[PDB]
Ligand binder design. Sequence first.
Ligand SMILES: Cc1cc2nc3c(=O)[nH]c(=O)nc-3n(C[C@H](O)[C@H](O)[C@H](O)COP(=O)(O)OP(=O)(O)OC[C@H]3O[C@@H](n4cnc5c(N)ncnc54)[C@H](O)[C@@H]3O)c2cc1C
Ligand SMILES: [Cl-]
Length: 437
Amino acid sequence: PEVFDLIVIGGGPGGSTLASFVAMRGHRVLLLEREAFPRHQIGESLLPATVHGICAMLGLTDEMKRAGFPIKRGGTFRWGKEPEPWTFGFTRHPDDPYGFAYQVERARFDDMLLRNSERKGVDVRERHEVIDVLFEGERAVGVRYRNTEGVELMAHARFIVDASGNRTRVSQAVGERVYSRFFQNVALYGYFENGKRLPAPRQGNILSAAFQDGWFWYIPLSDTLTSVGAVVSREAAEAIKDGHEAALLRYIDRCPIIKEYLAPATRVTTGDYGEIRIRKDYSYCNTSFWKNGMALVGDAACFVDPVFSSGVHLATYSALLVARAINTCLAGEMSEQRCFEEFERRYRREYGNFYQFLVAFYDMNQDTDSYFWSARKIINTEERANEAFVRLIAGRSNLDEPVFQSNFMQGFTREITELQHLAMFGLVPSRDGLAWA
Ligand SMILES: Cc1cc2nc3c(=O)[nH]c(=O)nc-3n(C[C@H](O)[C@H](O)[C@H](O)COP(=O)(O)OP(=O)(O)OC[C@H]3O[C@@H](n4cnc5c(N)ncnc54)[C@H](O)[C@@H]3O)c2cc1C
Ligand SMILES: [Cl-]
């Protein structure tokens, strides 16, 4: 049974990124991926930190350029108080640092990434499904898998990392997955050909649009292809079944901007983009991201919600953080505890930043007759007590007098909240950036 420095379970952006970064330091890594690449996965809109930070460190800048991925300068939102769409840009000027990102076909993007792993020296093996992580001495020491044929084998390493995404079958070995009560949403999504684009030089921007029952994303993948998804209540899903296509089509009709952008369009009916998928119970965090010899990265560890497109960034950032722990420990410096505690602290900080901001962002949409939006509001009480206090001591307690009248990780249990509080409170990289100094 083969011996490695690291075994990575899953070859999406989390797994391939971590594998590459440790192999780049000259270590033995195996990466097992259940599927044969290329394969469809949701998660198409990217951020500059991944495009200009991660992908540059991986040495993929040039290959990204040549791919023909639409260039994402920011996004447009129909969201909040006003009906008119507003826009954001990553930077004030088009070409200054971290100025843009891409809208990617994940099949091609992940494949591109996994191929780069190989070339970086990673032993990647497709059609290989991990079944169990193996423990000895209270430490993760290997995995059981099935290879390309039905054959059950084993492999061993000093470190085992679950990068196997939301359907991980091994994460419970590290911690308990705890679902957010706030982001209790289901996404229903398909692909459309020949749909319209945003104006100006913004054709490649993501568009997200709120309507009465939730919100839509609208991501251009090429001149002809658009990813389109409705994010609605979990409760609505339990009645979209036996009628996937009809549910989405009816949702499209009920969102003006999406209705108009898809009027010229035909839905893809064949291939990987001809299906309409559902994702449910996607918002969660684990009670722990590492134990002893094992770590969780990407969707295996935690996920917030698709608005503002943070998933691939989180996966790739956590991959870098784990890579640094592994590259620093395999060099006999520091300790496993110091390095993996730093990993979890940093990861929870970035996850927490997005969680907090997205709760407030959901809260800012005004739609007073929407059940969906009314149930996705910041739960205050203490601010309302404060406001009443302040009204009183300003001389304004009389609300009938016209002369005078002219929290944290919401939706989570205490355990997640406390872990997040410690990490956020409400080490520096080596010159290489591949380990800790
Ligand atoms: C509705 C929806 C919309 C989203 N939109 C965006 C977006 O616009 N932008 C963005 O950045 N993110 C988006 N995300 C999130 C994004 O999908 C994920 O965050 C991202 O794919 C995480 O990558 P990963 O490497 O951790 O996992 P994955 O991409 O899921 O890859 C894990 C890999 O592990 C493999 N695997 C599974 N089990 C095993 C096993 N037993 N053994 C071996 N291999 C296994 C799988 O085949 C897969 O290839 C969205 C998510 C949802 C739910
Ligand atoms: Cl996301």
